[PDB]
Amino acid sequence: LQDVVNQNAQALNTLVKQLSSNFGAISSVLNDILSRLDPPEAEVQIDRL
């Protein structure tokens, strides 16, 4: 019984920590890339995220 809880918690934790990944974007927070790139150059960055 503890293993199902542990596995679900681990899957959720890795899903959450995947928001820290760049995937090649200049930054991982969408707000800052949006606030410092004009749309025609921010779309290409957001697409990678």
Place this chain on the structure above:
Amino acid sequence: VIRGDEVRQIAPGQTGKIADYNYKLPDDFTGCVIAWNSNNLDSY
């Protein structure tokens, strides 16, 4: 007619005095741009 520098600014998603105050192209512009010197014809 455009004279002087900034002649290359006529393009989608370009910045500069001409592109921002004189002539701005849309982001998804679908078309061609043509230019040639015209000193013989247009030379205040």
Place this chain on the structure above:
Amino acid sequence: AWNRKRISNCVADYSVLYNSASFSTFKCYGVSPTKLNDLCFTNVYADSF
């Protein structure tokens, strides 16, 4: 022997440099020229040569 001036702890209005036509070329990578007036930075280096 290009010089390096470090500028910090000041309010830096970039609009004058963006709008002034005295510059032959003002091209930059990473951040857009028109939103520089709103971002905040740690420090800036001016390498002039």
